Structure formats: structure tokens, C-alpha cells
């Protein structure tokens, strides 16, 4: 309650700022009205951060290397530039994978060019080619190389695209250049966009002229689930129990071949709209594959999403969906019976960069908790369009 | 809610005629606003009395950008009824010089300065060349009525011809029409009937003929309009007469451009040019 109290609180909080900072930050704070359909008149997003105000946002390199490309396990990702960027992002995100690290999986490893002064002055293209050669002898079982560029790469004018083309043609290898310099974009969102563009332009269209893959009318691809602590595996077991076949996983526990097999798949299930809506739209426009957003946070959202997904297939899938819901009902009923009385009525404030504040609200409400505050570091206005109804 | 524009060659008293016109309309229960589209920001000094009104272009650059600009900082009512805005312009050689008008006109619509209490809106626009942001009123249909301030001298009649040519080009796209001619007099012979001859051939009408006076020279030092200085002045009543015909003007025509010889032949017969 207390909408006027919230407005007065916003006003008295904004008083410390200088005129420019106050005027800009006023646009980014709002009191939720669930009846609004267009967020942009009510609130503004996807703008540059005010200097010297201790923002929580990251860079495009974090959004590309750390979020999208990093979870892919059989590829080797090179942090092109100085050592800090690769060092601080090493194994800091829990994307679960099955493999032997250093032989056929390389997720928790840090491959970098380790730029020095002479690299900055003369360039690192020859160093990049030498590094690509060194990687192949050291790790013969890698199935592809990506070059995630840091700030000096674009700042000194290196040509990583031509190096990637030449080396890939020479070694018959997939080499993907990603121009994800941190100064590009205001947050990790442009990193998501750049990584999706790189996937579309260097990876996705490779098994286009082949048809050796045996497809099935029940083929789905999980898009935008990064297996944080094993989330994608739970979602996968829930989907496979429903009678579908999951061909691809983007990109938690993901493989390059699974990415290449995504054009064959009949339907795309997109868990995160913010990071992978671009490639979903591209696939819908190119291969004619429809896509939909689902939510597996909490029993209510999980059941709703399962029924919505089953509605896109024949009646056997719906019967299997009802079977799965009936099988799993007592477990979450017992969980609620145990934990809701302890958590009933508590108030929670949230602040996560995109999709997840809105995504977990249902799970909290399934335990009698209510979300007083929801917040995003990098979400666009469509995400706020989606979250105004849920708050 | 009629919006007009004053177009003419520089140096033909257009800024003063617009200001004394505006002062003449303020007294008769009308709330009007002046928008200075001339690059040099001397088009609101007699109303505001200010030495030099800060232009929108000036204060947008110092405040970072035009988004950080407040309407109460650009729109000053030095006279209670009259609202004055100076668009400003860039430095010479730096981009299009008319782009100051585009920023100011867009800014005023964005903040809604055209709301619920304006009877007249006047644009004092550079008329030497009609391009970029100077042709923007006619091109964007911002100013439905256009009055040209001309003179006996050939360049002023040539300037009036060019504006009429630009009105014809945008006649179909927009309601904008030539409302009449304003003849500002230098102490030369056979002027009023010369511009009447111009108007009769353009298909438009003369509105008034303001003669040169020395009362305006006294007003310049005051930084005030003649009307507020000496309301009993013969020029001050002349400006009321020009103002009253502006409100009660009803015919708005699509102009007829005049060729080089035909404009020239008008000058030779009157003896202005040999």
C-alpha cells in the first residue's frame, strides 16, 4: 500500500543528487500500476549509467563471454587482450557441465592472449594466429574456438575477423570472432546481442545442406537456460517425462553440435527472453520454427508452462503432461505444507538484471511471500511491459 | 490558435515590425508568443527589454543536451501576455545554420508551450535563403499564414518572390498560404504603389505600408516598443492599423511566382532601377 508514501520516499531519496543526476534518475524509479500495458511512458530503461554513482551493471564482455559463450563446453574461448578480464570471470558463474576439463571440456579454464605493451603498440593479429596454432596442438579434442575481444582489441584496430577466416580455412576449424568490447553498450544486454549475432553468423548455418539427422514431430530446443546449479537438467527431465525430445540446450551444458542441430527442431522453448530473443526471432524468420516463453519457477508457473507447451502438440503429449503433473503434485504439496507456514506474509525486495525478478515472483507467492520491490540492472522496456502485470 | 510567420530579407525592419505588431496585439486582450527563428537573437529584445535573450541552442550546449533544458528557462514573459523564445543558431561554418530552428520548434511542441492560452504565434524567420530550418515552418505546416516584409529595393522584391516559390511547392502538402505583404518604407519615391503592383501580380494583397520614422530611434535606446514608449505616436497608431488588419484578414492565397524580366520590368517603369 501507501502509493503516495512511495512517491514521497522516491522524492526525498532523489534529493542528494546534482540536477543532472537527479533529473535522469527520476525517470528510472516508478510505482507499479498493474493496469498499465506500455511501461515506457511510466518508466525508462536501457540507458547509460550516471558516472560515479556505483552502478551494479557489467560490460558487453561479461554479457557475451561470461553469459552466452562460456557455458558451451567443447569450445575453447579466448579472452583477447590483457589478463584481468579473463581472470575475474574464471569459474565465477555456476553453469553446470558434464565432461573432463582440459581434454574435451574447457568451461572453467582461462585462455587469454595476455596482452603486453608491444601487443598494444604493434598489434596482436600475428599473436592471435600463433595462439590459435598453439591451442590446436595443446588441446586436439576441442571442437571450435571463439575469440571474445576486450576493450583494447577494438581500441587499437585489430582485424580478428580476417584472422578467424584464414585460420579456420587453414585448420578446417570453426573460429568465431566476437567483438564484445566492454565499452560497447551500456550493460551486458549488448553483449547478449553481439553473442547472438556471432552465433547466427558463424555457427547456426552449418548443417543447412545436410539432412542426415533423423527428426521427430516432438523435437524441441531449450533456449536461454544456462544450467545455473543444474536448472536446465531439472527442466530437461520435466520436458522429457512429458514425451518430448530435447535436441539443443542454449547454452548450459551445451555443445556446438547441439547448436548446429537447432534448425532441424520443430519448436523453441525460450526460458530467458532478454538474452536469446534475437536468435529465436532469427530462427523463426529463417527456418520457420515457432518459439514461446515458459517459466519453471515454482509449481504454479511450472504447471501453467507445462500445459501451455503440451497445447502445441497432439493429445498424447497432453495426456503425458497430465501424468507428469499428477505424479509431481504430492511432492510440492508436501513442500508447501512444510514451508509456507514459516514463510507466510514475509516481504521481499528483488534486484536481478533481466527476466529473473519477474520470473521468481510466482515461486515466492507460492509460499505466502509478497514482493514489495522488483528491479533490473539491464532490462529493456519490453521486460518491464512483462513485469508490470506480475507485481 | 492561428500561427503566423514573418519572412523577409535581413535588414528590412522585420524583427521590429513583428515586435511592435506583437505589442499592438497584447493591449487588445490577446496573449501572443514570439519565436525568434533568425540566427541573430535580436528579435525579442524590445519585448523582454533584455540585453540578449539566451537562445535555446546556447543553453542546450552548456546544459549538456536539449533534454536537460527546462521550458521556464527558455520561455520568458517579460511582458505578462507576451511569450518570447529565441531559437539561436550554430557558429558559422559548423553544420546547417537553420538547425537551431528545428531544435526549438520541436522543443516547444514537446513541452506543450502551445496550450490553451495562445491566440497568435509569430515566427521571425530569416528570409535571405529558404532552406533547412528556415524553410521548416512552410515545409512542416508549422505556420499557416505567411506575411512578407519587403521594400522598394530589388533584393527585397527578389526575396519575396523566392518565399512565394517555396509556398507553392508545399501548397498541396500543407494549408500554409501567403497572407499578405508588409511594405517597410525607406525614404524613396514611388514605393507603396510599387509593392501594390507586386502584390496585384502575385495574386495576394498588401496589408499596410509602414513609413520610416524617428520615434523608433528613441525606442531603440529604451529597448522598448514604440507602442509602450509613446502610444500617441503616429508610427504607434500605424502599427495598430497594421495589427488590426492582420486579425481581420480573411483571404489566404497560393502565390504566383514572378519571373526575372517581369520583376525587372516593374522596377524600370517606376525608376527604382534604371
Amino acid at each position: 500500500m501507501s502509493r503516495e508514501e512511495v512517491e514521497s520516499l522516491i522524492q526525498e531519496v532523489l534529493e542528494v543528487y546534482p540536477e543532472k543526476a537527479r533529473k535522469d534518475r527520476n525517470k528510472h524509479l516508478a510505482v507499479n500500476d498493474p493496469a498499465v500495458t506500455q511501461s515506457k511512458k511510466c518508466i525508462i530503461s536501457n540507458k547509460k549509467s550516471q558516472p560515479g554513482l556505483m552502478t551494479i551493471r557489467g560490460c558487453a564482455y561479461a554479457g557475451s563471454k561470461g553469459v552466452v559463450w562460456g557455458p558451451i563446453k567443447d569450445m575453447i574461448h579466448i579472452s583477447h587482450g590483457p589478463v584481468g578480464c579473463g581472470q575475474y570471470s574464471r569459474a565465477g558463474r555456476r553453469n553446470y557441465y558434464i565432461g573432463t576439463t582440459g581434454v574435451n571440456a574447457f568451461v572453467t579454464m582461462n585462455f587469454t592472449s595476455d596482452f603486453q605493451e608491444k601487443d598494444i603498440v604493434f598489434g596482436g593479429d600475428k599473436k592471435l594466429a600463433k595462439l590459435i596454432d598453439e591451442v590446436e596442438t595443446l588441446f586436439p579434442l576441442n571442437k571450435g574456438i571463439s575469440v571474445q575481444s576486450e576493450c583494447p582489441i577494438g581500441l587499437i584496430g585489430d582485424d580478428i575477423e580476417s584472422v578467424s577466416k584464414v585460420k579456420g580455412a587453414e585448420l578446417s576449424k570453426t573460429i568465431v570472432p566476437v567483438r564484445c568490447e566492454g565499452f560497447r553498450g551500456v550493460s551486458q544486454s549488448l553483449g547478449h546481442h553481439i553473442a547472438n549475432d556471432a552465433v547466427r553468423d558463424w555457427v547456426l548455418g552449418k548443417r543447412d545442406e545436410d539432412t542426415t539427422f533423423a527428426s521427430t514431430p516432438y523435437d524441441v530446443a531449450i533456449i536461454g537456460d544456462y544450467n545455473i546449479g543444474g536448472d536446465a537438467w531439472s527442466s530437461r527431465i520435466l520436458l522429457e517425462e512429458m514425451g518430448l525430445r530435447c535436441v539443443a540446450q542454449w547454452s548450459g551444458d551445451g555443445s556446438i553440435s547441439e547448436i548446429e542441430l537447432t534448425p532441424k527442431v520443430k519448436l523453441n522453448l525460450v526460458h530467458c527472453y532478454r538474452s536469446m530473443n534475437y536468435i529465436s526471432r532469427h530462427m523463426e524468420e529463417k527456418y520457420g520454427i515457432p518459439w514461446m516463453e515458459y517459466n519453471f519457477f515454482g509449481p504454479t508457473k511450472t504447471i501453467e508452462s507445462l500445459r501451455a507447451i503440451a497445447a502445441k502438440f497432439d493429445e498424447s503429449i497432453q495426456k503425458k503432461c497430465e501424468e507428469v503433473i499428477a505424479k509431481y503434485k504430492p511432492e510440492w504439496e508436501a513442500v508447501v505444507a512444510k514451508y509456507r507456514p514459516r514463510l507466510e506474509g514475509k516481504r521481499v525486495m528483488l534486484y536481478i538484471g533481466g527476466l529473473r525478478p519477474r520470473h521468481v515472483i510466482g515461486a515466492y507467492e507460492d509460499l505466502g511471500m509478497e514482493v514489495v520491490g522488483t528491479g533490473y540492472e539491464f532490462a529493456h522496456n519490453d521486460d518491464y511491459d512483462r513485469t508490470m502485470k506480475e507485481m | 490558435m492561428r500561427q503566423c510567420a514573418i519572412y523577409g530579407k535581413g535588414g528590412i525592419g522585420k524583427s521590429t515590425t513583428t515586435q511592435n505588431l506583437v505589442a499592438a496585439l497584447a493591449e487588445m486582450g490577446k496573449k501572443v508568443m514570439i519565436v525568434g527563428c533568425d540566427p541573430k537573437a535580436d528579435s525579442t529584445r524590445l519585448i523582454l527589454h533584455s540585453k540578449a535573450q539566451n537562445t535555446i541552442m546556447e543553453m542546450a550546449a552548456e546544459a549538456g543536451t536539449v533534454e536537460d533544458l527546462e521550458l521556464e528557462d527558455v520561455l520568458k514573459a517579460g511582458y505578462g501576455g507576451v511569450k518570447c523564445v529565441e531559437s539561436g543558431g550554430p557558429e558559422p561554418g559548423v553544420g546547417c545554420a537553420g538547425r537551431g530552428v528545428i531544435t526549438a520548434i520541436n522543443f516547444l511542441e514537446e513541452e506543450g508551450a502551445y496550450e490553451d492560452d495562445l491566440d497568435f504565434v509569430f515566427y521571425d524567420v530569416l528570409g535571405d535563403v529558404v532552406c533547412g530550418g528556415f524553410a521548416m515552418p512552410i515545409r512542416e505546416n508549422k505556420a499557416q499564414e505567411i506575411y512578407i516584409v519587403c521594400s522598394g529595393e530589388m533584393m527585397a522584391m527578389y526575396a519575396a518572390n523566392n518565399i512565394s516559390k517555396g509556398i507553392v511547392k508545399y501548397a498541396n502538402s500543407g494549408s500554409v498560404r501567403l497572407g499578405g505583404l508588409i511594405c517597410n518604407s525607406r525614404n524613396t519615391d514611388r514605393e507603396d504603389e510599387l509593392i501594390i503592383a507586386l502584390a496585384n501580380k502575385l495574386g495576394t494583397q498588401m496589408i499596410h505600408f509602414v513609413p520610416r520614422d524617428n520615434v523608433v530611434q528613441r525606442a531603440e535606446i529604451r529597448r522598448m516598443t514604440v507602442i509602450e514608449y509613446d502610444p500617441k505616436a503616429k508610427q504607434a497608431d500605424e502599427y495598430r492599423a497594421l495589427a488590426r488588419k492582420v486579425v481581420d484578414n480573411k483571404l489566404l492565397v497560393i502565390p504566383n511566382p514572378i519571373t526575372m524580366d517581369e520583376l525587372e520590368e516593374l522596377l524600370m517603369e517606376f525608376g527604382i532601377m534604371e
Binding site: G154, G157, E161, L190, H282 | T65, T103, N106
Partner: protein, 121 residues
């Protein structure tokens, strides 16, 4: 990256190869190749380098950032519709008209048209 420059001042359209993402902008590529886009400032506010850019490979359109300075100049020149502003803010997709001194080359094929006049006609 392949860039095709086109202008009525140019007898023939010029085809150049450019390195993507350089700190030097489209203005760099143009100046190195003798393309006479009018550059009249060093702070990116005059808008005289306005060019019309066409992505010839529509599948290979790269997401970019439209900075607040370029956006405001495009409004002051008038070459920024409200739909293109919303498209850039929500989808991070470039508008049709750009400032060459503030445009970063991407890895695609581009057609760059200019009239030899400063932005704002």
C-alpha cells in the same frame, strides 16, 4: 567489411574494404579513401556528416548502441522518426540515417549514401 560509397557528387560508386570495429569511425574509412563526406566539427554536434546507410545483407545486421549524443543530433537535424528511436531503444537496431563521424564499422556489407550537404538539408 565491404562498404559501398554513393553520392551524386561521385561519378562512380566506390567499393572499399574496411576493418570492423576500429576506434576510427566511418569518417576514418571515408577520409582514407578520398570520399568527401563534409566533416565540420570535432565534437560530434554539427551533424554535417549525415549519411544514409543500407544494410545490404539483411540477415547479417549487427546490434549496436545509439549514443545519446548521436540520437539528439539526429533529432535536431530531423532524421530520426519516433519508430526508429523506439527500435534503437528496445531492439538496439541502427536507424536508417547515421552520423559518419560517430558510426562504427561492423562486419557486414553497407551502402553509404550522402548528398554533399550538411545534415538538415
Amino acid at each position: 567489411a565491404t562498404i559501398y560509397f554513393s553520392s551524386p557528387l561521385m561519378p562512380h560508386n566506390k567499393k572499399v574494404q574496411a576493418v570492423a570495429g576500429k576506434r576510427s569511425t566511418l569518417l576514418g574509412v571515408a577520409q582514407e579513401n578520398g570520399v568527401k563526406i563534409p566533416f565540420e566539427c570535432q565534437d560530434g554536434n554539427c551533424g554535417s556528416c549525415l549519411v544514409k546507410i543500407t544494410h545490404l545483407d539483411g540477415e547479417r545486421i549487427k546490434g549496436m548502441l545509439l549514443t545519446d549524443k548521436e540520437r539528439n543530433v539526429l533529432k535536431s537535424v530531423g532524421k530520426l522518426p519516433k519508430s526508429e528511436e523506439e527500435r534503437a531503444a528496445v531492439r538496439d537496431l541502427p536507424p536508417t540515417y547515421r552520423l559518419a563521424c560517430q558510426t562504427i564499422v561492423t562486419d557486414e556489407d553497407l551502402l553509404v549514401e550522402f548528398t554533399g550537404e550538411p545534415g538538415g538539408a
